[model samples]
Target: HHHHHHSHMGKQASASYDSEEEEEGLPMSYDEKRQLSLDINRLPGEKLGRVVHIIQSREPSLRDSNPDEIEIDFETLKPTTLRELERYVKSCLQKK
Candidate 1:
């Protein structure tokens, strides 16, 4: 059930000035979530107990697959609804 098409391994575009009226503002949210995933990847809690606690605190549906193994690979199991997780991780960090 895994289908990923986000990162295409290809050469860079040659031109950025191809003006077209098809400015449909798509993928803006995708870009934001892409950066969000990157932010989570850079975080320091791949195996932290605190991070596991954070993951369990959210809805069980968020981490639906093998919650028991979450601490082993936290970054790989991204919180699809992790805008809140990102904020919560920061808050957790501030306490210590």
Candidate 2:
């Protein structure tokens, strides 16, 4: 018999942006990273609908690609500002 145990204590939430907030931290989840990417893409217009489209479009799963390494290939995935990332997540959760 084989037993496998996975610990989530140090693991951050799949939908969290802690790393973006803290300088030293684990990498963000694919979803979180995607969310950040979409948010940054929508910063120019700040349009919720457009942001959702951007997220959906680049989403690895939706694009039929590996979601783990998936990323928004815009300027940069590592955002320099949290407000922009938050806005994108907020907009996505608005309709949910």
Candidate 3:
């Protein structure tokens, strides 16, 4: 069983694995969560977390492989906007 904990602002999530009901209780809604993610990814390398967190967050919305497989190697993906993250996640997901 995997479980994860939410970061401050309900933005970046760190997971070895965590929850659905727990996530729903977050101060931000899913879209808001995504929006914060978009903003966060726009920051510099030092500012960004190891993974973009956008694609991973959406995994629950999709059925198939877990997103843990995706976020680890994406350090180079410096997505600027919500729109960019959307397309990137879309493309990456399609590839999987």
Candidate 4:
């Protein structure tokens, strides 16, 4: 499982993953495996943007894929100010 940690203004946020058993022993596909883990470091806005980008880039026919979306409990994720959100997006883009 992938993990990420971010800190801002003395507040620390971290995310992790726990796997559940699937009926078949085969490993989960990349998208299925990643969907849950992505929430660890993401706030609401970041989560929305990531989903939007994925839908727009991959499944244009299913633009309204909220049904396929995984609902995360935002309360469990760390909250960040708008400025911090912008900075985080910028850093991700820079790596691209």
Candidate 5:
């Protein structure tokens, strides 16, 4: 009884193609498309915004007791450089 017919046949023929001098072509593969380093100007604005948002969420807890302790007027302040974010986050790390 061949009721359970499970066909698992695959091709095993290797096709040999051209083997000449391989030079640079128009279809260039760049590593920049892959995971890249975070830069202030180069990277996306949303990426940096989220980073600051996360920092704000974490700092709110401490702000309750001592409002003056932590500062960084997010209302009127806007980060122009990644260096500022780096310093802000590093200092936040030092807090707790």
Candidate 6:
């Protein structure tokens, strides 16, 4: 499951993620994709529209994950540079 999560998130970062390493050949090897970071401190309300489309665009039965209140540093936001912003943005996103 972690690998799945890591794979999707490869669009943001790869280092620090212990098992991330570029392979010699082949394509889409869990580490070859491009990963870019968000620039805003929050999810950028505009992105939600796109995010929503990305979700409902395919999974109509996907239920809410209902994660924690982000009361920790392990938080993450769209443009989440710091951790607390994660608490605010990601927290709000989760609630909805």
Clash number for each model: 0, 0, 5, 0, 0, 1
Preferred candidate (TM-score higher): 1 or 2: 1
Winning model by lDDT: 1
Candidate 2 lDDT, tens digit per residue, 10-88?
7555763433333332444567666666655555443544543454454544444443445444343224223344544
lDDT per residue as tens, model 6, 47-86:
5333433333334443243223222221122122222232
Q: Best candidate per TM-score, number?
A: 1
- Reference-based TM-score of each model: 0.33, 0.26, 0.25, 0.26, 0.23, 0.23
Per-residue C-alpha lDDT of model 5 across residues 1-96, encoded as one tens digit per residue: 768978898888676554443222222123321211223234345554544454455556542443334433333222332234543344443431
Query: Candidate 3's residue-wise lDDT over 18-92, tens digit each?
Result: 323222222333574465456545655533432344444544443254544444322232333334444344444
Model 3 residue 38 CA deviation in Å = 0.6
Question: Candidate 1: where is the Cα deviation over 4 Å?
Answer: 1-28, 46-52, 61-80, 89-96
Candidate 2 weakest ten by summed lDDT: 74-83
lDDT of 3: 0.42
Clashing pairs in 3: 2-17, 3-17, 3-18, 4-17, 4-18
Supply the global lDDT for candidate 2. 0.47
In terms of lDDT, which candidate is stronger, 1 or 6?
Answer: 1
Between 2 and 5, whose lDDT is larger?
Answer: 2
**Model-by-model lDDT, in order?**
0.48, 0.47, 0.42, 0.42, 0.39, 0.31
Assess the local accuracy of residue 31 in candidate 4 as a C-alpha lDDT between 0 and 100: 53
User: Which portions of model 2 show Cα errors greater than 4 Å?
Assistant: 1-22, 45-96
Ranking by TM-score: 1, 2, 4, 3, 6, 5
lDDT of 4 at 34: 47
How far off is residue 50 in model 2, in Å?
Answer: 20
